[PDB]
């Protein structure tokens, strides 16, 4: 498996058959462009008529493509396909215990009601994280969770939970001009941790206005207070973003009748959207990110009793 | 005789092995090159200029066409008030201003969009709103009345009114716009492949716009990858450009419009404004009705006019209104034109119809089935335009769909849900419809076949009418099978075109099966009558026996065939004389359970019965039936189009733009034919199916409301008798904010 | 000084000297090698009409894997060594129509047929990774597959022969 | 616009030439309104080939009685409009649904 | 009819047309199908456009 | 009526323009292959091979 | 490493790459520049079917010389600078006939049509060496020239109006 070089009109292709070769490249140039699905790209250039004359394709590389089993979730390669991700993670849910495949479950749920077979099979999960959509359903997912991302550049490697820090502005993230993201970890479901992920039954714009969330909380142990909470959301924004104000004010409270209505007063403020907010459906966008939560509240008060 | 029998689609095994070819699927020549139309990015302004130079400098540029290129007129339309291409100014985004000849696709594209256009924005109408505010309108209004308003609007105990509107649709057949023109080179003729219901017109257009006459173009459709009316005369928008192309390039140049293109330019379904009044008695018996409908017509007239009149004919649907009033108005914006699409206007006036009756029936605090049905019409009742209705079977279909559905019981289980449930609701609601058979414009109803019987006794028919899915061709080859009494392996149907069968009406209207079925009756009868004395002679001879005998004794076996609609003609003034052939009747009822927390619902049950009489091919039929609801339900629940307040589309994909998919069909779905109904109005007793069943799709709309009204009475307020308004389609957003809770407060 | 770019399709071998990453798959099977089985529909992945079956050797699972894809977005550059299969890979009305093509068929699954491709690329796919499948993975198998003329019901009940 | 097609071909003898000849005489309007494009077999099946030198005698008077049954079938409207053009009464005769193909 | 039968198909497939022809004289009342055939045969053979 | 004139044959101008097409000037399509036919050389005999 | 053939044809320039040696002019006219006016008759120089103008300036004589010449055994390596002149390069129905096509269309010289290009052609390079011939010349002009239809007759009593 060598690496090859393929020259046409206005665009270079080059398909990288080594990490090494894969960080030089991207060292080289910064600017060029990575493809594995270009179920992304394949948008951009031809509905945004953008031209990358510098593209490398990394799909060959072991590592971006390694699915690994260790004692704090299961780690795939950014390259992976989701139906390998959907794959591994239905065999997971299947022989694991319930309390370890919460946020898997989440994740699970996302990749239903996703595209089509045909796009999961080449869509890679690297792809949909740095694509950085405002309405990704992955990301809100993958933040809730604190989900690892091992980033990398020749030279250099680091491991961070993506966080609201993640993504800086629109399309934009936490990643080097000449950085790419070379594997994630989905996390292994705690004791007195509970997950869920929900997402609008609908889309009417190109990548905003569409509600997606992921919601994760933690109790602590044999009481029903609250130890961490984790509200992200995605279509409320030009990004993925999380009512951290809301979920501070709720640590070590009770989850009750209280706790529901002061969310949800903070959700209201907190996620306000203007009455020119781009997108439209602000009445019904409100009342999802409520909505959502109250499923959540409720899902919850069952997996506690 | 295969008539009356489950036929599937002749061409079926092609199209599932990619055999069967579609326009883009033709070969190009070696020399053959591309288009790619310019368009507007405002909704009205002024071209101050147009700068080429960029486009120029790409790869394989070979040409920019402009108004000044065309050789002939730049005048077109159905009602000749269009431009081929746009001159000094814009009506709307999509507007045509050019196209680019290139030789690959990407060249013409890339080129394409580098054609720098400067515009001087001009006040724009958008909304019907828009449109009323600024008496923006094509012609005057039309309407339907009969009896007197006041004096049924005063005997009625109740008197409810309000503003309804149903949001358009975009046709969405999977295969888009699309053309092939060959310049022969030779008095101007040329010959084209196009995916179009409308040879004719495309013929006459690609004359008009070239000046020359009609019978040097030669139109030729194999088939639609699906046409639903988006192509009965929009397809001439891509048409007239590539034939342009042709003649000034003199290479054969084709053009297929990209999904996001198509959506944009080509226009789609009118959506409807509508403002109703309604006099009842306490019984739920409607006295008194009035209604102005509003239509968005687009940057063009087009069919807006008859489509608002077939709306009119429809405001009644199966009701009968002693004292009726209602009126159109088509209103003139800066949209792409909207044009024809399955329904043709009845879809929107059948629905307002439904919203006042639901709301008749609920005011009333009586059951729904209970008040249309005693509204219903009785057999030889006449109409608000007063036809008589002969062979009513609405009533067949209504007592037997609520029978086979188990209505009655379902009903009670539907209502213990609701009490068992608070976050969750179901709906139920059956609803009926008839579809009035026929073009309202007099003219168009007639129809012309050609037949030609090989001296090898293979048969090969051609006739007026397109393919587009619908099995036309089947249906034609099935009829002709039976008229000359031979097996159908021996007849042939290769396609449809301009020099075999002319001046045809576009294929449309669901009476191509009636009509071009008449016209290939004929045309087998004409080859009979010559065969006979053949078959006299020699009576145990087999058919190819008797047709080489008719050849060596020279008899002509090649032969016209015709048809046209008769007694038909209604008048405005007068409002009298039978404006269709008969009427078309279903019934569906349909189940569904929304959630009140997402605005999401699901489609668990519905059950159809269809009136098409005896049907020449009931697998065919039903398969109507269903797509037909499928693109209803699609309508009524699904598909929402959006543009930008400045009129630009902003879902033009199907990442944008939902149309049903596997999953949104109702998880038991059963469609039933009704059973000795016969039609003596048409071919072989058979029925017009293509259209009449698309409004049933309604069913799910208002099971959906049923639901949103138990789920109101649950967390909102306490009024029986409210009624909220809840326009089309019935979106999760609409559903959900309808759903008012500690929440959406 | 350029790669070629090798792959499959049906089971012949493509060798384009010149590829050229822009060129998509679908364009690639319609213009160079003039296989116009597979449609174009909407050019953004949503409608399927473009589908295919990929297949490619993982150095890991051993096995040949078999999956589906949309070819109005498969760059024909990420194809090396990968065998594309169309619907005439498997089977025509000049030859033999493979079980999924004439089951569709007979059963009214096919109107305008212009989706018809696509999703009998979909159920290939499904049958060559399992077989006999569920009623659901049938259903799941046309997720990214749509079909304006027949309102599915008469497609999924075809295949339903194929499960258990 | 006329369109006439015969099972007659050209071969340099100048058959089209005579065809619109008969039928602008036939038809009693201008050579110029019609119109031969080609010979095809989905337009006049079973045809003989064009051959000893019949084919202007032969499809010269198939073409003359296809051009009677047209004058047949326009005759109603060239009454109702006398001072009417040729055109006025094919429209008529369109609009008031008479076949024009024969 | 010629092209039909050396095909085995119904005749109602094949559409043969004539725009003109640069001289016939007879010689192309019946010997034209020996090209004919045999061009249709390639095209039918080979699925591609033959001349 | 213009039966008994002189009218020249209605393609002359076109076939002096070269304009006239003619089988051969059909352009080719982008796939259409070419065929030459194989003849024998002798007046009669038998085909041990080819 | 090769030279490029560079020529012209009715007033366009023609750069051709890679000319291959045993192409023929009329190959090449047909073919690659779509002009079918040209016909092929013979293939072996007897007909004129194949006739066309060939231009091309002489270090001697000064002047740029005209000639006719039978295209179908003419091989486009010999033309480098040299300027060609096919039917479609002197008039048009589309635009405006040479007196030359007008001429011979309406005397009847025309019947089949397939040698009238070449007739054309070798009357207007008559034309260009000497605008007014004698019947003589104008006969001899057409040596080369075959016609199966007409009987010749009409084609030079057309011509005819030319001399004196
Ligand atoms: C029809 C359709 C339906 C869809 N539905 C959904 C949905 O419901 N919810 C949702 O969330 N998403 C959805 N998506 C989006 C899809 O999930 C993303 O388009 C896809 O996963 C991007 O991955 P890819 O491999 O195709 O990437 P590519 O097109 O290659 O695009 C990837 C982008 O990420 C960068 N990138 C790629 N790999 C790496 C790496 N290893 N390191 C660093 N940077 C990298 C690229 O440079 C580029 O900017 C849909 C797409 C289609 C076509
Ligand atoms: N499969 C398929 N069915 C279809 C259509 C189509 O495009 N595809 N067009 C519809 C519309 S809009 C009309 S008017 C009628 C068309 O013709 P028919 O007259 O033969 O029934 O078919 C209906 N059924
Ligand atoms: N110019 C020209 N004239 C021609 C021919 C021809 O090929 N070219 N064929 C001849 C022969 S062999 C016959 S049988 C008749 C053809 O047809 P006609 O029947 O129309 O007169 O034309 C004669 N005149
Ligand atoms: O009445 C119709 O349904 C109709 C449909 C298409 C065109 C003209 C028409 O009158
Ligand atoms: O929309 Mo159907 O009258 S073509
Ligand atoms: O030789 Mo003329 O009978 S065709
Ligand atoms: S064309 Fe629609 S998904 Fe490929
Ligand atoms: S048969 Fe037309 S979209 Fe499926
Ligand atoms: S072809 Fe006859 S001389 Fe050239
Ligand atoms: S006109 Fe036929 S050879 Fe001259």
């Known amino acids: 498996p060598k690496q090859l070089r393929f020259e046409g009109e206005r665009v270079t292709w080059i398909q990288a058959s080594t990490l090494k070769e894969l960080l030089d490249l991207k060292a ?12 992304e790209i394949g948008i951009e250039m031809k509905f945004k008529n953008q031209l990358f004359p510098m593209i490398i394709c990394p799909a060959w590389i072991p590592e971006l493509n390694a699915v690994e089993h260790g004692p704090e979730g299961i780690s795939f390669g950014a390259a992976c396909a989701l139906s390998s991700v959907e794959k591994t993670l239905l065999e ?16 699970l749920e996302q990749l239903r009601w996703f595209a089509g077979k045909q796009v999961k099979s080449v869509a890679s999960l690297g792809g949909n994280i740095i694509t950085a959509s405002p309405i990704s359903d992955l990301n809100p997912v993958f933040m809730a969770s604190g989900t690892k991302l091992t980033i990398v550049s020749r030279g250099t490697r680091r491991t961070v939970p993506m966080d609201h820090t993640f993504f800086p502005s629109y399309r934009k993230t936490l ?15 705690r004791e007195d941790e509970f997950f869920s992920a929900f997402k609008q039954a609908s889309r009417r714009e190109d990548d905003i206005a569409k509600v997606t969330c992921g919601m994760r909380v933690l109790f602590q142990p044999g009481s029903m207070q609250v130890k961490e909470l984790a509200l992200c959301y995605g279509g409320m924004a030009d990004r993925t973003i999380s009512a951290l104000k809301t979920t501070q004010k709720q640590l070590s409270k009770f989850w009750n009748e209280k706790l529901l209505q002061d969310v949800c007063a903070g959700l209201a403020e907190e996620l306000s959207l203007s009455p020119d907010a781009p997108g439209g459906m602000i009445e019904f966008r409100r009342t999802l990110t409520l909505s959502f939560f109250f499923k959540f509240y409720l899902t919850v008060l069952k997996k506690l009793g | 005789d295969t008539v009356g029998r489950p036929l599937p689609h002749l ?9 069967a070819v579609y326009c883009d699927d033709i070969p190009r020549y070696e020399n053959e090159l591309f288009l790619r139309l310019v368009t507007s990015t405002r909704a009205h302004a002024k071209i101050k200029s147009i700068d080429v130079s960029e486009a120029q400098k790409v790869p394989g540029f070979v040409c920019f066409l402009s108004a000044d290129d065309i050789p002939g007129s730049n005048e077109t339309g159905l009602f000749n008030d269009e431009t081929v291409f746009a001159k000094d100014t814009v009506t709307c985004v999509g507007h045509i201003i050019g196209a680019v000849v290139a030789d690959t696709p990407e060249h013409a594209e890339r080129a394409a969009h580098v054609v720098k256009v400067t515009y001087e924005d001009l006040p724009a109408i958008i909304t019907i709103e828009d449109a009323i505010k600024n008496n923006s309108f094509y012609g005057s209004e039309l309407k339907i009345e009969k009896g007197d308003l006041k004096k049924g609007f005063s005997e009625a105990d109740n008197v409810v009114s309000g503003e309804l509107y149903i949001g358009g649709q975009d046709h969405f057949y999977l295969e888009t716009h699309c053309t092939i023109a060959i310049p022969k080179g030779e008095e101007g ?5 196009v995916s179009t219901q409308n040879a004719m017109k495309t013929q006459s257009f690609v004359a008009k716009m070239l000046g020359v006459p009609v019978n040097r173009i030669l139109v030729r459709v194999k088939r639609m990858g699906g046409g639903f009316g988006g192509k009965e005369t929009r397809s001439t928008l891509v048409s007239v450009a590539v034939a342009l192309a042709a003649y000034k390039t003199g290479h054969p140049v084709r053009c297929m419009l990209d999904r996001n293109e198509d959506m944009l330019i080509t226009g789609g379904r009118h959506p409807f404004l509508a403002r109703y009044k309604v006099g009842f008695m306490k019984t739920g018996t409607i006295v008194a009705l009035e209604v102005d409908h509003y239509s968005n017509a687009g940057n063009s007239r087009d069919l807006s006019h008859s489509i608002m009149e077939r709306a009119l004919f429809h405001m009644d649907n199966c009701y009968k209104i002693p004292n009726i009033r209602g009126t159109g108005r088509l209103c003139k914006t800066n949209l792409s034109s909207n044009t024809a699409f399955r329904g043709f206007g009845g879809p929107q006036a059948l629905f307002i119809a439904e919203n006042w009756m639901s709301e008749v029936a609920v005011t009333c605090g009586l059951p729904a089935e209970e008040v249309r049905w005693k509204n219903m019409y009785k057999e030889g009742d006449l109409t608000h335009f007063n036809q008589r209705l002969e062979g009513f079977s609405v009533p067949r279909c209504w007592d037997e769909c609520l029978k086979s559905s188990q209505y009655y019981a379902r009903k009670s289980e539907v209502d213990k849900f609701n009490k068992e449930n608070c976050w969750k609701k179901r709906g139920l609601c059956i609803i009926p419809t008839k579809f009035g058979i026929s073009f309202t414009v007099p003219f168009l109803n007639q129809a012309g076949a050609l037949i030609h019987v090989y001296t090898d006794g293979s048969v090969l028919v051609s006739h007026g009418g397109t393919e587009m899915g619908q099995g036309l ?8 099978s039976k008229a000359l009494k031979i097996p159908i392996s021996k007849i042939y149907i290769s396609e449809t075109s301009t020099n075999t069968v002319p001046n045809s009406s576009p294929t449309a209207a669901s009476v191509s099966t009636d009509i071009y079925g008449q016209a290939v009756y004929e045309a087998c009868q004409t080859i009979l009558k010559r065969l006979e004395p053949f078959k006299k002679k020699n009576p145990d001879g087999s058919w190819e026996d008797w047709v080489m005998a008719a050849y060596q004794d020279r008899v002509s076996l090649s032969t016209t065939g015709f048809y046209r609609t008769p007694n038909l003609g209604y008048s405005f003034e007068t409002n009298s004389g039978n404006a269709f052939h008969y009427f078309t009747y279903g019934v569906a009822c349909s189940e569904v359970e929304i959630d009140c927390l997402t605005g999401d619902h699901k489609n668990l049950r519905t059950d159809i019965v269809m009136d098409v009489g005896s049907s020449l091919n009931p697998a065919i039929d039903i398969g109507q039936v269903e797509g037909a609801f499928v693109q209803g339900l699609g309508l009524f629940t699904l598909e929402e189009l959006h543009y930008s307040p400045e009129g630009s589309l902003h879902t033009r994909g199907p990442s944008t733009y939902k149309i049903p998919a596997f999953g949104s069909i109702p998880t038991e779905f059963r469609v039933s034919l009704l059973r000795d109904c016969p039609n003596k109005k048409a071919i072989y007793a058979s ?15 208002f099971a959906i409301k049923d639901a949103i009204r138990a789920a109101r009475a649950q967390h909102t307020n306490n009024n029986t008798k409210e009624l909220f308004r809840l326009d089309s389609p019935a979106t999760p957003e609409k559903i959900r904010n309808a759903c008012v809770d500690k929440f959406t407060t | 000084t350029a ?5 499959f399709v049906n089971g012949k071998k493509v060798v384009e000297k010149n590829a050229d990453p822009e060129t998509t798959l679908l364009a690639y099977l319609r213009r160079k090698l003039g296989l116009r089985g597979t449609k174009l529909g909407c050019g953004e992945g949503g409608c399927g009409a473009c589908t295919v079956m990929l297949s490619k050797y993982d150095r890991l699972q051993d096995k040949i894997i078999h999956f589906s894809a949309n070819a109005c977005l498969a760059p024909i550059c990420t194809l090396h060594h990968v065998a594309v299969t169309t619907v005439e890979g498997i089977g025509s009305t000049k030859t033999r129509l493979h079980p999924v093509q004439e089951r569709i068929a007979k059963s009214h699954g096919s109107q305008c047929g212009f989706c018809t491709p696509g999703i009998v690329m979909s159920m290939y796919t499904l049958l060559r990774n399992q077989p006999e499948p569920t009623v659901e993975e049938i259903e799941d198998a046309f997720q990214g597959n749509l079909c304006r003329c027949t309102g599915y019901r008469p497609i999924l009940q075809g295949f339903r022969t194929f499960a258990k």
């Not at chain 2, 029925?687 to 709309?701: C, D, H």
């Open chain 2, 473 to 480: 061709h089947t249906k034609m080859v099935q009829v002709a």
């Open chain 3, 3 to 7: 790669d070629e770019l090798v792959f």
């Open chain 1, 175 to 189: 990643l080097g001009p000449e950085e790419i993201l070379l594997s994630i970890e989905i996390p292994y479901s």
């Open chain 1, 28 to 39: 080289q140039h910064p600017e060029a462009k990575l493809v594995v699905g270009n179920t």
């Open chain 1, 92 to 107: 997971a849910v299947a022989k694991l215990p319930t309390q370890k495949t919460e946020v898997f479950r989440g994740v």
């Open chain 2, 11 to 19: 061409a079926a095994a092609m199209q599932a092995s990619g055999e």
């Open chain 2, 687 to 701: 029925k017009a199916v293509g259209e009449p069943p698309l409004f049933l799709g309604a069913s799910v709309f």
């Open chain 2, 189 to 193: 003729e040329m010959e084209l492949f």
